[PDB]
Design a protein around this ligand. Structure first.
Ligand SMILES: Cc1cc2nc3c(=O)[nH]c(=O)nc-3n(C[C@H](O)[C@H](O)[C@H](O)COP(=O)(O)OP(=O)(O)OC[C@H]3O[C@@H](n4cnc5c(N)ncnc54)[C@H](O)[C@@H]3O)c2cc1C
Ligand SMILES: Nc1nc2c(c(=O)[nH]1)N[C@H]1C(S)=C(S)[C@@H](COP(=O)(O)O)O[C@H]1N2
Ligand SMILES: O=C(O)c1ccccc1O
Ligand code: MOS
Ligand code: MOS
Ligand code: FES
Ligand code: FES
Ligand SMILES: [Ca+2]
Lengths: 1286, 99, 50, 50
């Protein structure tokens, strides 16, 4: 093998034994020790692994810079390429780069795991355009996801490159002259002609071909050899589909495969040209050539706008997309509809054919022979009388897989409306790209008119049929899209042939962004407050700079010991079955295999889980797909994964219960019914003028913390001692569960948590699934062992939010006043209890939202099913119950024919009222939040503008909704409301604070340092918090229920008071001395400078049996108004504007609190409108990665996004008058859901029927499928019994 | 610990003070983030001074557990400890001594 | 002295805020901590000696 | 201490000490040291940050 030579951050790397299977991400992290680049998914959709690549382009005679996903970039494609990672642009140890400084100071980093990738996407943009436009800045992040921030701060801080939370005037200006130079050595090497290279790995041989002749000789000798250019398809096939291609040929260096030629018929691109290059060339052509010649080009560009992100488009080749031949390719339908010419060659042969329906004969195949390669593609200029359109509709606009995608072309006889040629090609409607030939052939010679529209729609409905078992489901929606896209094409062509009814015009408009507008309002601190007292000030997260530089250490970033091994979980592939046998004979053959662990290897107990109803490793039976059966330990992660894949388990299926309906039918529940009942329901229903009954469903949610679960376990070899580094919110339970499994006392186990790259409740208990397995491996082998879950394992195994089904009945007066309410809740709990009971209790505690209901009955049942156990997720049952409440409230308004805001206001609690669980509402600020939100959002004025828009538009509608929320603060299990701290003041006066809480991005340590600095009256610079550990603060409650600031704040405060009391005698003797003087005097006088602090929330204890006692210490409140615009023909929608007013008492840190409000709101927006998990009828999760599970993207947030923290609202019940903010704002994301529902009502009034009191059901999430299907019209109708009783 | 058996003696002291077997007590290591500003282990006084500091920390634990012992006199150390935890009483304390 | 185990130290730099964790054969973790902090020019609270 | 496993990237230090009871250090030449396989660096007073 030849040496692979490339550069990383300006340093030369010579790899003498490059393995073709090694990705750049693995190489950076495991060989170069550069851990700033992260693994977030391994499938190209999160951007956490983003790096910049720079090379000398021989064809352009210039150095080019572009971004790429290190998780998919083979190092074997990087010969003579210069890589720049986050570490290469700046650091806190030298100096931060402006991109790093701004994202940190703008509050654009919370947990920090996505920060390096976003920093690199932004950095790459600036290296290409030092003064980008706002649009270029937003587009730079099509391929980057953040789960914490809600995106607003990242964009607002970066907008600077185009009281207040940050000051742009302080920012260091960008100076391009100070950027690292391209490696001089690489610039010299450019003067040496390319030579063919060969790399040999453990399983694969890679040939880098330098010339076209070499490529053709290689393909003639090895027809099976797999070509790889960008690796964005092959990398997925290798990693996720268990494919192994022993020989790969990379033809990327070949001039002919990279040539661009402008011919008389069109523009030709070599097959290796990156999509970003195609995009640039076509944009240039569209700007220079007449509109009539660029119809096809604009179609290609419209698809490229929504094709992955910058990282993928910069490496993905044209040839790769065409030859991969995926049924959902967004480009093949366009190339097929336009008859794009393909030049195909093999040694000694060359032919050119226009792409047509025959080019794709069957699933993933094309008409190329085994020895042939695609050389170039010529995209045609459009002719006179020829028009083209391309459309794509997915689950999320940005970086998503098409549900239906198409290319449509029509050629008319000269100057007429008479069809000469017509081509309608679709992706997503079959196992290959297809053309609706039967349908289009019938229109040849017909004229473009209403009858043609009807005939084509009827034809498409018949020809593009979908059987009920079609892969991907969404049968009705997909068929509706095929007709809807044709309708858009039809109207667009009429416009181009030309007037369209003005109310129809917007149906022809391509998606357009409106400029962003963001405002944050909060309260300034008192005039006389000391500059060193930072409580109330917008201090950035203390680790934000290190997060932006890639220096912040997350679990897997901790270096491995030389003898450290890797663990891979072996999980069930059946929902419910007996395990008959396990065969490890094949796994034992994989190189580096160490051992297979199972239940029999456990030295202590195999009984685990919060309620002791789970196994550590399955014994005799598996009860869900993903149920952990055992684990393989090996010398490398790849070897452990390969060995685990071949462990063969033989099963015998048992009857399974998957759904809530299955559980109810089978009486499959955990425990008995939970219930809260107040008043007289029968009397209430008798009094009611109206009564509405219904059923509602809300789907689950995957946490999608950017850092998945991970544990490192270090066995000491003495007395059973073990030290573990874990990404968990619950070190205490990690510690006791590990000790229980090992059969040793809890005092032998040390758990340390530095920080988590997100938790969101998902790491409150389920992190032990991994911790305990890794601990067993360390115990059995005597070696350190680690495991970080891949995203697909994480989504499958670890549980998520509980789906809820509700059956309700509400009685109300004609005025809208509620007089009775019954709601029966059912949650899908999965295969163990875990936190399901407490979650249902919190759901019952919030079924009132902010409304007084005199007679009310709510019940709850936990469904026991053969699915992974669901758990805590930000909101913990509250969002589900609050959603159900707002759904019936929205129906009361509709039924009464009254404005929704009036009906909500008149039902709202008042100061001093009692809730349905009889707790008094003291300091009830919803009314102020409501009136202020109505005013600042200009709700009334906009309501009329929305109505006007709906009158003027037939196929687009707007919706507006304002909703309130209240969230009870405290753990509903009394004993968890306790908190400890430990503080030491060293002899130099520096202070080390330790407390029971953990940092997961919410800024808890930052707030505790702010609190300690105010209490001690010393600068925050003298205080430090390093980590959370069980040997500093024991028996800690999980960092949850949004109360960490409240309780650890008090514990830290109390520890500081003790320190002050001890120092007082020294301060009195030397009043003019310094803190350092007093500390040293205390030390010399032998006064201890170490103390604990503790806090117990008072007066808590509610009983469901007596419906009495305080469930919560106080409530956090807020109101949100959101406006949306839906596309009635596709299901897509824009979040136009959202205004939030939140009561967080006297904020300890308005930057962090506004960040929590925005982040929580966006996660709620995701829950209610974008995020959906799909499972087979047998209980197997289909959606296991960002490609199929769509969380909010940069482009998903409200365009105008305003957040205000309520002024003059101190909360006497918590530290420094503040209020909990973690979870309360999430439900406000439902304001988007109800604005969408309002818009759908307008669309139904327009095309469905005139029943203005109709109550149509809309379950959550309101995805494009649900939105489109609810917009009933002539198209949904197109996509019988012998007798009917009269 | 440098071989002189200081941790052994401290476990013996803590066991006598708490009136529980030494098997329930453990000392893993010495660290600056658990006990700060320590004098060097020297002058032959470690047993004397850390013995007192350990003794005092044990007294504080006993005082916190006393209400639970009085409520359930026939219970076990484990019962009292869990009752204290469930009642949100801290089971962590410092101890200190000055000759 | 002829202690059978001679002097020994392992120093682990964390890469964050000057933090360092040291495993040391010493009777004086306090002075080890402050002397390391003094040489590095960082506050004593950044140094952990075990 | 030395029984604690080494990290995969853990390096080793060897002190360079005076061979004279009392003298001026005129110069230090590490050119031969730099040739030893595995050499990473020579550290001296000017490398101290604090
Ligand atoms: C996060 C993500 C998002 C994506 N988004 C989209 C999307 O929105 N729409 C869409 O359609 N696709 C999408 N893709 C798919 C993928 O990026 C494209 O199919 C890409 O264009 C393939 O190019 P490549 O160079 O990376 O292919 P590779 O993976 O390198 O090769 C792909 C296949 O093409 C063959 N091949 C390559 N070049 C030639 C040639 N010259 N002659 C003959 N055979 C050849 C290879 O042998 C292999 O079978 C996405 C992928 C990821 C990872
Ligand atoms: N950035 C970030 N913010 C977050 C989370 C997170 O994992 N990352 N977890 C949320 C959840 S589920 C909770 S309960 C609270 C917990 O922290 P707190 O009690 O300090 O507010 O933070 C919320 N905000
Ligand atoms: O929110 C709660 O009420 C709660 C109760 C018990 C455990 C975890 C929790 O979040
Ligand atoms: O209470 Mo959060 O960890 S769901
Ligand atoms: O006092 Mo002993 O350490 S000489
Ligand atoms: S880890 Fe590479 S895109 Fe997510
Ligand atoms: S700050 Fe972006 S994922 Fe946490
Ligand atoms: Ca559960």
């Amino acid at each position: 093998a030849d040496e692979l030579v490339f550069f990383v951050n300006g340093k030369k790397v010579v790899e003498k034994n490059a393995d073709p299977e090694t990705t750049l991400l693995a190489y950076l992290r495991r060989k170069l020790g550069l851990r700033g680049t992260k693994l977030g998914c391994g499938e190209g959709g999160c951007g956490a692994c983003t790096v910049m690549l720079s090379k000398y382009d021989r064809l352009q005679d210039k150095i080019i810079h572009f971004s790429a996903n290190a998780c998919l970039a083979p190092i074997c494609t990087l010969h003579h390429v210069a890589v720049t990672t986050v570490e290469g642009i700046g650091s806190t140890k030298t100096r931060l780069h402006p991109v790093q400084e701004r994202i940190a100071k703008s509050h654009g980093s919370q947990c920090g795991f996505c920060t390096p990738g976003i920093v690199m996407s932004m950095y790459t943009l600036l290296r290409n355009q030092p003064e980008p436009t706002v649009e270029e800045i937003e587009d730079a992040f099509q391929g980057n996801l953040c789960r914490c921030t809600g995106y607003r701060p990242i964009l607002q801080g970066f907008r600077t490159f185009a009281p207040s939370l940050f000051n742009p005037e302080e920012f260091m200006p960008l100076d391009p002259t100070q950027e690292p130079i391209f490696p001089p050595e690489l610039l010299r090497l450019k003067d040496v002609p390319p030579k063919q290279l060969r790399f040999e790995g453990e399983r694969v041989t890679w040939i880098q071909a330098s010339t076209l002749k070499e490529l053709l000789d290689l393909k003639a000798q090895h027809p099976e050899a797999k070509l790889v250019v960008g690796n964005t398809e092959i990398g997925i096939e290798m990693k996720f589909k268990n494919q192994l291609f022993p020989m790969i040929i990379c033809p990327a260096w070949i001039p002919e495969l990279n040539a661009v030629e402008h011919g008389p018929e069109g523009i030709s691109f070599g097959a290796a040209c990156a999509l970003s290059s195609v995009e640039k060339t076509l944009l240039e052509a569209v700007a220079k050539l007449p509109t009539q010649k660029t119809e096809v080009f604009r179609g290609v560009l419209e698809q490229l706008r929504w094709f992955a992100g910058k990282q993928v488009k910069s490496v993905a080749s044209l040839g790769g997309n065409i030859i991969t031949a995926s049924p959902i390719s967004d480009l093949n339908p366009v190339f097929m509809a336009s008859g794009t010419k393909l030049t195909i060659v093999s040694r000694g042969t060359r032919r050119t054919v226009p792409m047509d329906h025959t080019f794709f004969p069957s699933y993933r195949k094309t008409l190329l022979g085994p020895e042939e390669i695609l050389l170039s593609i010529e995209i045609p200029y459009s002719r006179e009388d020829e028009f083209f359109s391309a459309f794509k509709q997915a689950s999320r606009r940005e970086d998503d897989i098409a549900k239906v995608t198409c290319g449509m072309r029509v050629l008319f006889q000269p100057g007429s409306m008479q069809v000469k040629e017509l081509a309608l090609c679709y992706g997503g409607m079959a196992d290959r790209t297809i053309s609706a030939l039967k349908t289009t052939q019938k229109q040849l010679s017909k004229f473009w008119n209403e009858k043609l529209l009807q005939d084509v729609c009827a034809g498409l409905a018949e020809e593009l049929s979908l059987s009920p078992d079609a892969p991907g489901g969404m049968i009705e929606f997909r068929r509706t899209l095929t007709l809807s896209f044709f309708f858009k094409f039809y109207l667009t062509v009429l416009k181009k042939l030309g007037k369209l009814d003005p109310t129809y015009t917007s149906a022809t408009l391509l998606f357009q962004k409106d400029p962003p507008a963001n405002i944050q309002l909060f309260q300034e601190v008192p005039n006389g407050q000391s500059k060193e007292d930072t409580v109330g000030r917008p201090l950035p997260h203390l680790a934000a700079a290190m997060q932006a530089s890639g220096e912040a250490v997350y679990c897997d970033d901790i270096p491995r010991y030389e003898n450290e091994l890797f663990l891979r979980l072996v999980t069930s592939t059946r929902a419910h079955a007996k395990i008959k046998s396990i065969d490890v004979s094949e796994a034992q053959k994989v190189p580096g295999f160490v051992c297979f662990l199972s239940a029999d290897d456990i030295p202590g107990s195999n009984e685990t889980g919060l309620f002791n109803d789970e196994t550590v490793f399955a014994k005799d039976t598996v009860t869900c797909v993903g149920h952990i059966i055992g684990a393989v330990v090996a010398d490398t992660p790849e070897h452990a994964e390969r060995a685990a894949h071949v462990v063969k388990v033989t099963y015998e299926d048992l009857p399974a219960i998957i759904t809530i309906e299955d559980a109810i039918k089978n009486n499959s529940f955990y425990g008995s019914e939970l219930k809260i009942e107040k008043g007289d329901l029968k009397k209430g229903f008798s009094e009611a003028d109206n009564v509405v009954s219904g059923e509602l469903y809300i789907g689950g949610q995957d946490h999608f913390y950017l850092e998945t679960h991970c544990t490192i376990a270090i066995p000491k070899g003495e007395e059973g001692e073990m030290e573990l580094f874990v990404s968990t919110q619950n070190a205490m339970k990690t510690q006791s569960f590990v000790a229980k499994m090992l059969g040793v006392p809890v005092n032998r186990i040390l758990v340390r948590v530095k920080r988590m790259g997100g938790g969101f409740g998902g790491k409150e208990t389920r992190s032990t699934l991994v911790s305990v397995a890794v601990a067993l491996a360390a115990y059995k082998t005597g070696h350190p062992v680690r495991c970080m879950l891949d995203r697909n394992e994480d989504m499958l195994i670890t549980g998520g939010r509980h789906p809820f089904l509700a059956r309700y009945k509400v009685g109300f007066m004609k005025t809208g006043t509620i007089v009775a309410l019954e709601v029966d809740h059912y949650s899908n709990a999965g295969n163990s209890r875990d936190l399901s009971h407490s979650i249902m209790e919190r759901a019952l505690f919030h079924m009132d939202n902010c409304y007084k209901i005199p007679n009310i009955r709510g019940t709850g049942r936990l469904c026991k099913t053969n699915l992974s156990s669901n758990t805590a997720f930000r909101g913990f049952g509250g969002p589900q119950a609050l959603f159900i409440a707002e759904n019936w409230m929205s129906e009361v308004a509709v039924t009464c024919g009254l404005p929704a805001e009036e009906v909500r206001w008149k039902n709202m609690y008042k100061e001093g009222d009692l809730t349905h669980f009889n707790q008094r509402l003291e300091g009830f600020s919803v009314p102020r939040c409501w009136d202020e939100c109505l005013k600042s959002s200009q709700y009334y004025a906009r309501k009329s503008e929305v109505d006007k828009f709906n009158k003027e538009n037939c196929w687009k509608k707007r919706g507006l909704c304002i909703i309130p929320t209240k969230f009870g603060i405290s753990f509903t299990v009394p004993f968890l409301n306790q908190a400890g701290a430990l503080i030491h003041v060293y002899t130099d006066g520096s202070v080390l604070v330790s407390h029971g809480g953990t940092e997961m991005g919410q800024g808890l340590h930052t707030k505790m340092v702010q609190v300690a600095s105010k209490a001690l009256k010393i600068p925050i610079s003298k205080i430090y918090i390093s980590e959370t550990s069980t040997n500093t603060v024991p028996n800690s409650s999980p960092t949850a229920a949004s109360v960490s600031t409240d309780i650890y704040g008090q514990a830290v405060y109390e520890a500081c008071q003790t320190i002050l009391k001890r120092l007082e005698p020294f301060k009195k003797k030397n009043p003019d001395g310094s803190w350092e003087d007093w500390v040293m005097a205390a030390y010399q006088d032998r006064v201890s400078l170490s103390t604990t602090g503790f806090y117990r929330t008072p007066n808590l204890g509610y009983s469901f049996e007596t419906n009495s006692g305080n469930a919560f210490h106080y409530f956090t409140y807020g109101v949100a108004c959101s406006e949306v615009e839906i596309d009635c023909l596709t299901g897509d929608h824009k979040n136009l504007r959202t205004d939030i007013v939140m009561d967080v008492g006297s904020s300890l840190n308005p930057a962090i609190d506004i960040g929590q409000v925005e982040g929580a709101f966006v996660q709620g927006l995701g829950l209610f409108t974008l995020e959906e998990l799909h499972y087979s009828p047998e209980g197997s999760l289909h959606t296991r990665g960002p490609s199929t599970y769509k969380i909010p993207a940069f482009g998903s947030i409200p365009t105008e996004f305003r957040v205000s923290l309520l002024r003059d609202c101190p909360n006497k019940k918590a530290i420094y008058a503040s209020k909990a903010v973690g979870e309360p704002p999430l439900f406000l994301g439902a304001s988007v859901f109800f604005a969408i529902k309002d818009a759908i009502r307008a669309a139904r009034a327009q095309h469905t029927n005139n029943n203005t009191k109709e109550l149509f059901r809309l379950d959550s999430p309101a995805t494009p499928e649900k939105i489109r299907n609810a917009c009933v019209d002539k198209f949904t109708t197109l996509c019988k019994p012998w007798s009917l009783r009269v």
